[PDB]
Design a protein around this ligand. Structure first.
Ligand SMILES: Nc1ncnc2c1ncn2[C@@H]1O[C@H](COP(=O)(O)OP(=O)(O)OP(=O)(O)O)[C@@H](O)[C@H]1O
Ligand SMILES: Nc1ncnc2c1ncn2[C@@H]1O[C@H](COP(=O)(O)OP(=O)(O)OP(=O)(O)O)[C@@H](O)[C@H]1O
Ligand SMILES: [Mg+2]
Ligand SMILES: [Mg+2]
Ligand SMILES: [Mg+2]
Ligand SMILES: [Mg+2]
Lengths: 326, 332, 326, 332, 326, 332
């Protein structure tokens, strides 16, 4: 299997009391957010509440998506987990509130005795019906059909045929939603049927999209922020960054000497955590060319010369601004 | 067993909690305080059951978290399933398959029931419009994709239903359209509502907003709720007030009872301090979290330490805005 | 039968000489505009004239829509009367000038001997001579088809088989039209086939929609205003307001004491006619709940306390601006 | 009996009122005054009847109410029905089903006739395009719904029509496209019109506008007539002047004749004074109102008193605007 | 048969050595641009290069479209010449880059052993096969299909059945394109398959469409201006203008005296060449009305009195600004 | 004979011109200079051929004419036809058929090959998506009438392809998506790309842009390269430098060899000076122009007089702008 940016993440790495171990299940540090996410895992597993929402807020590269995906590993594959980005609502076929409602219905599961289906699957199955060769266009499924599907699902649950599995919606990049989308989430989050929601945002005091210079904290209006519980993620220390760089090396199947690892951590103190982690695979490939099987400080140094980080490149654009295009 | 309906934000609301004289009780049917707005909601509720006056418009204005949506669920619970109660967000009219006026027309027509005797069948005016719009149009009631239904279809059904009412075959049950967050409507939508309310087939229009003197969407004019003054002249406004210390505690007691959470008396006092400070919604959100933390330590009653623990773990908006400001230029 | 806000309006209430009676057919006061509307009624009844427009202008609540509906009642059910709002031109299926053209063609009637059809009915009938998963759609019907329909209608009139019934288009909220619609109305009103048009507007000097910053008197361009005659509606005195409140109480089947009627008169003078008229039914419901068969002053006072007019609500929101959303 | 055509704004216009030497008569065929503009329209009409030169463009400029559309109706009447005369407003090309350049192309090709002998059938190029676009395409000429016709269809139809012309199987009837209020077109439409007029198949374009030096739509640039200077270089501009007292009284006489209204000479003097004071169209609009008041009076001839009565009843723009500004805070 | 604006243009009028004659093939003057266009004709005739772009730049009425059509006449009907206007990219059915790609593929020809087709013809033929009655919408043809057609055409060329005919795409009014179209033109022009492209523009240092007031030399981005060679066209002298007016009189079948020709030359110098050329046919019609078959001077002065140029009309509008609308 | 492929802008480019140690030769495979950028591109090529790490992002930054697209073409040539290489301009995702995130999803899915053995088939993930989305969806692969494919189909195909991979019925060939001119993407597209690169199925993304600190499209915020900082943190930046005199001369030599053009050494010196004065692409265009002018005079070697002649005939941007500014009144 191919290695992804969150392949190392296996769970929240909490002990039996819910307190976060310093390094467990691929995560390192960030104990307060990991402990808070453990409470949210217990909220989802209880299956009692509906529509409760949380927001992961912090600087970039501080594990907001890793925490959300760590929650998904804790729940398992039985529980539905519907990831999305905020920019997916801008569909050319259906309105934006339909795209949110479709994603919300995807996050409520149903085990029918065996079939694993979502409420969205029952909606689209019953929405569609002889000349059925046109383009499969999505449609704005009405609340009447969704009301009827809810009644049928309750009848099968009372008959003992179906088992409800309330899951999780994960709206990463929630600032990409506009004011119409945010206001629609008030109705969606207040429903007795709705799933648990996890928002993630890295903005601070930016204009809400679709308004006219209405700045709000994060990128979310204060109306929606009143309806959510914010979980804060901190920056990582150099030692925490070094541990994270080490875990990514074992995930990518890369041997790195301690002197190289210290240099990558020093490169990690400048630049970003993401930049130093990205140098591991080019450094390993460069080591394999030299006729070597391990990365050496000089392999990390040469890759740093070849590949520029964001701040280093911005200095070139600032100095050579007349040469570059506007 | 886990049914499709679970403990939501307004699940404890089981009516308006009024006597026969529409006098609100202090604590009844999940509602707490807010006596002037609940009394006004009772008067509007008796108007809806009367069903004689068409196109009556009411706005529920008030600060956020003052029970505007709680009152509207209170009216919907008290009215029962027989009378239609169409509930929409303001942003739902912005459709790709149909115009804003068509979306508002369908919402108006959905809120008018027709009991037709063959045995009784209950169908709204919107259902009859869609079925007559095209061959096997009843697919479109579920899938959407109705398109813009022609004016001649709705005029013919208006005369046909009026014929059946005079014959006594049909009976018309006018319902409610509740547009929560009505400030999301634009000036073209509000102008359509001015003449849509003047029709004799129109339902009772409840609306809710928390906006001050703000810009109307689609224009650059300030107006007292984001709503133009011409529509506001056609309205009666119901004002919900913010809650006192005792009303906040009573609301938290009912939510604890709804969620099946036991808390000590000191926990009710201290989480209340956190709430009168931050917001009512934040204090409600800490009930289930503190119950889970108390459950993790094998306790049975939520204590003050559980409230302080979840207070530290989960930030309200005011505190989270402060930590972001001390990390200015880290956030994008 | 359900009571709308214009249900009491039965006609213009003038006398045989055309002068307006002070109170007749549900209307009260506004005598100059009623006499002008009677002249428009005789213009419509005479046939003989195409595409003549009239604008009802005045502040809110002065009976512009009431006068248009009084004209509709005076003409009767035989004459077509097509109401619309300006915001109905913004269709997703067809362009705005098509929506205007279809409404203009709806306003022209035809009695084919007893079949009552409009030119728009013939147009859509001949444009669609279809189901099997093919939804009907509004289409941009060409000038060619409407030309052939005009020729066939003239042929049927020449044979004595059809009788033309030129009706009325009533475009309320004409300010909601944009500059392209107003420019298309110049061509539409100049036709020899077009009906009599009635515009209504409550706007002062304000920007035309669709233009950058072009201000204009009624929100209408000056070119279209040159093409229309203007009927002014004036504000009502307290005695006229009291008479209107009495007619609305009679139409709603509500008994009201003269003390309560005077109190509603002062409330309407203090706030608005529409607010005081809206207070009648709640006061009747409160009186009935209290066991009374008529409204007394205390019921009106309690209802005024329970329900706020727009200006009092604006005062409350201006006082508490920081606590309300922006 | 009432036919579908009734007395419109330009129903009294039957031509341009010129003699064989194109010299305009002072009062002929419903036209009055505008001697230079009518002479220019006569020259353009002879150019259209000649049909040799392709894509020649003309603009009728002048103040509002100066007979630009009256002159265009005079050209249309004088040309007769055999030649095409496509009349559109500038706002009609903003279609939801086709692009602006497609709508302009269809308007161009509607204005070129093709008379095919066999029985004789007169058909426009746009009709042949829509017929050969698809198998059942002829329905789309009535329903609209043509879509964007492929350019290959238009090239092969141009080639086949040219082959018919060389064979003698078909005759090309070049006609007129009249775009009233061309200032509603945007910069993309004008840019398309620059190259569309260079085709050998293009018709004679006539345009009308009353705009001064104003913003071009879709830009932030000022230009005369709201048109780009690049397009204005391709046109010949015809200027219509305002009317004197005598021409105003003559137009009011002709409109009274059209409407079958008899007025005293003092009523004509008062209405001419009103027309000079306010606008020609307002004075024309008062004619049938005064006639209706005279009929309600059981009179036979419109007097000064009837004119003053309808002057008091119906306001022009100036008096209405002044009374609105007196009560300005009441208006929204 | 009908006389168009460029119907007198028959070629570039160059001698055998490539130098431009003073007057030949309907063109007059403009010798540097005509020689550059001859070099571009040799470039197109070589059939070696792909995707090379040319920009014709100069003030209005300097023969940019005349030079492009002269190049088209020089190539002949065998070579495909696809004229295009920049505003044609704004299609309701397909995206703008699809419209550009379709025109680019239209400009590449193919003679199959004898039928003439383009790559766009094979694209639309192979994109699609009840469908005959269903509306033939344009579609966003994928690069997979175009690559497959390229392989099939290469196989045809290998067998000797087909012969490739690379042609020209003439995008007049290129300033009407927006920044997305200009950016796509980099990829379109840098391809090994693309035809020669000719652009025309008369804009000065102008704002690029689709950008926020980013001003640029020809209304065209510097990125695309780096990719094109620029051919400059000049304003004409009075003698060149008189020669052009004489050629237009000969082409339109109009006899004109030398005194009338001199007066038209003065009028053209005073206003524009295009206006003076437009005066010819009205003056001929006026002479025919007056029983003559040759324009004398008084016919030209009468037509100049009757018809206004742009500057005189702008002067009247500026003088009478309050009377005209805005 | 004349084939479909002719002499393009990058047709001389045959690879990256690296030795087995990924060290660039000074002149090899049509590539000259840019030693650091070519070495980095070789490292990226080895990463692509490895196919272990998913969703890797690389940005090629530098001034215009510095070989960013040349480096991308060299990487595509050295990679070979077997591995997928999807190339798109940034403006191509602005589709009327589908949303921007859908277009980026289809571009991502086209870059992941699936080699299926039975005879050996090879298809992208997008091919399987379009085939399974509809009963006759395979026509939509060629016509592009896919619409927005449902996410259920894509995740089901991911599960099925993973099952085939485990059972040995299929092999995954991760390729490259090359977005040239990525500054044309807007903020929604960049935000989608942030999470698209985090999936294990994503290809190696490569990006090119010549922008400095500039506004991000769809926002008012400035950022380096026109890209937001959050996406820039997820990628490695490769910088291309401007060319020296001898590098420019070698590039002109290789382009003369590609075009079968013979030049004298003095013509080479003059053209190198012209290329340094104005731009590299202008000199490369003047190669073909001077070759044609030399052929016109029955020559066989391009001389300095031919270069001067085509320098006179064809203007670069700076001379054109200066000559325009001398007549700015005439230009519109
Ligand atoms: N009087 C009340 N009695 C009981 N619970 C209440 C009362 N008022 C509000 N609540 C509860 O407090 C929370 C407030 O949310 P609610 O949607 O009612 O507020 P709102 O006034 O509509 O605010 P917003 O402007 O943010 O939409 C909900 O849980 C609601 O059930
Ligand atoms: N050198 C020339 N010799 C002869 N006729 C010419 C010449 N230049 C222009 N013309 C004619 O003058 C008229 C205007 O020229 P043209 O439309 O080509 O100019 P342009 O403004 O450069 O073009 P465009 O706006 O189409 O890009 C046309 O009739 C053209 O045929
Ligand atoms: Mg609420
Ligand atoms: Mg006119
Ligand atoms: Mg030209
Ligand atoms: Mg490039």
């Amino acid at each position: 299997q191919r290695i992804a940016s969150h392949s190392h993440v296996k769970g929240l790495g909490l002990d039996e009391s819910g307190l976060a171990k310093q390094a467990a299940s691929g995560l390192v540090g960030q104990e307060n957010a990991r402990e808070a996410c453990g409470v949210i895992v217990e909220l989802i597993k209880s299956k009692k509440m509906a529509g409760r929402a949380v927001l992961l807020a912090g600087p970039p590269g501080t594990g907001k998506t890793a925490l959300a995906l760590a929650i998904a590993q804790e729940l398992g594959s039985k529980v539905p987990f519907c990831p999305m980005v905020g920019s997916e609502v801008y569909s050319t076929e259906i309105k934006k509130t339909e795209v949110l409602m479709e994603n919300f219905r995807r996050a409520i599961g149903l085990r029918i005795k065996i079939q694993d289906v979502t409420l969205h699957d029952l909606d689209v199955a019953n929405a569609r019906p002889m000349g059925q060769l046109m383009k499969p266009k999505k449609t704005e499924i009405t609340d009447k059909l969704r009301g009827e599907i809810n009644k049928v699902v309750n009848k099968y649950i009372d008959q003992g045929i179906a088992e409800l599995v309330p899951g999780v919606l994960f709206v990463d990049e929630v600032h990409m939603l506009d004011i119409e989308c945010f206001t629609y989430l008030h109705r969606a989050l207040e429903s007795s049927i709705a799933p648990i929601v996890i928002f993630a945002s890295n903005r601070g005091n930016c204009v809400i999209r679709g308004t006219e210079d209405i700045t709000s904290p994060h990128g979310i209006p204060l109306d929606l922020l009143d309806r959510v519980m914010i979980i804060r993620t901190m920056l990582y220390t150099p030692q925490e960054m070094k541990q994270i760089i080490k875990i990514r090396a074992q995930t990518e199947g890369i041997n790195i000497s301690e002197e190289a690892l210290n240099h990558l951590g020093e490169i990690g103190t400048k630049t970003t955590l993401r930049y130093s982690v990205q140098l591991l695979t080019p450094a390993n490939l460069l080591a394999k060319i030299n006729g070597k099987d391990s990365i050496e400080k000089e392999h990390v140094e040469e890759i740093s010369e070849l590949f520029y980080d964001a701040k280093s490149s911005a200095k070139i654009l600032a100095d050579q601004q007349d040469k570059y295009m506007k | 067993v886990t049914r499709i309906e679970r403990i939501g934000a307004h699940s404890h609301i089981r009516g308006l909690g009024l006597d026969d004289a529409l006098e609100p009780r202090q604590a009844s049917q999940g509602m707490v305080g807010q006596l002037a707005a609940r009394r006004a909601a009772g008067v509007v509720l008796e108007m809806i059951r009367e069903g004689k006056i068409a196109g009556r418009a009411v706005l529920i204005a008030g600060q956020p978290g003052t029970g505007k949506t709680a009152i509207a669920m209170g009216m919907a619970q008290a009215l029962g399933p027989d009378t239609p109660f169409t509930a929409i967000a303001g942003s739902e009219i912005f459709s790709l398959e149909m115009s804003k006026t068509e979306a508002l027309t369908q919402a108006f027509r959905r809120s008018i029931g027709v009991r037709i005797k063959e045995v009784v069948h209950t169908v709204s005016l919107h259902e009859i419009d869609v079925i007559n719009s095209r061959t096997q149009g009843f697919l479109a009631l579920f899938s959407g994709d109705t398109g813009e239904i022609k004016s001649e279809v709705r005029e013919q059904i208006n005369a046909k239903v009026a014929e059946w009412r005079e014959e006594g075959k049909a009976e018309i049950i006018p319902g409610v359209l509740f547009i929560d967050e009505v400030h999301m409507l634009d000036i073209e939508s509000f102008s359509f509502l001015n003449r849509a309310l003047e029709s004799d087939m129109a339902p009772v229009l409840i609306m809710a907003t928390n906006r001050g003197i703000t810009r109307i969407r689609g224009t650059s004019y300030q107006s007292p709720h984001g709503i133009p003054i011409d529509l506001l002249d056609r309205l009666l406004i119901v004002s919900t007030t913010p809650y006192s210390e005792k009303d906040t505690k009573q609301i938290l007691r009912i939510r604890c009872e709804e969620e099946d959470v036991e808390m000590s008396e000191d926990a009710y006092t201290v989480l209340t301090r956190i709430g009168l400070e931050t917001s009512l919604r934040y204090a409600i959100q800490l009930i289930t979290a503190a119950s889970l933390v108390c459950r993790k330590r094998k306790g049975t009653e939520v204590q003050v330490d559980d409230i302080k623990r979840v207070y530290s773990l989960f930030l309200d908006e005011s505190r989270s805005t402060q930590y972001m400001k001390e990390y200015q230029d880290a956030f994008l």
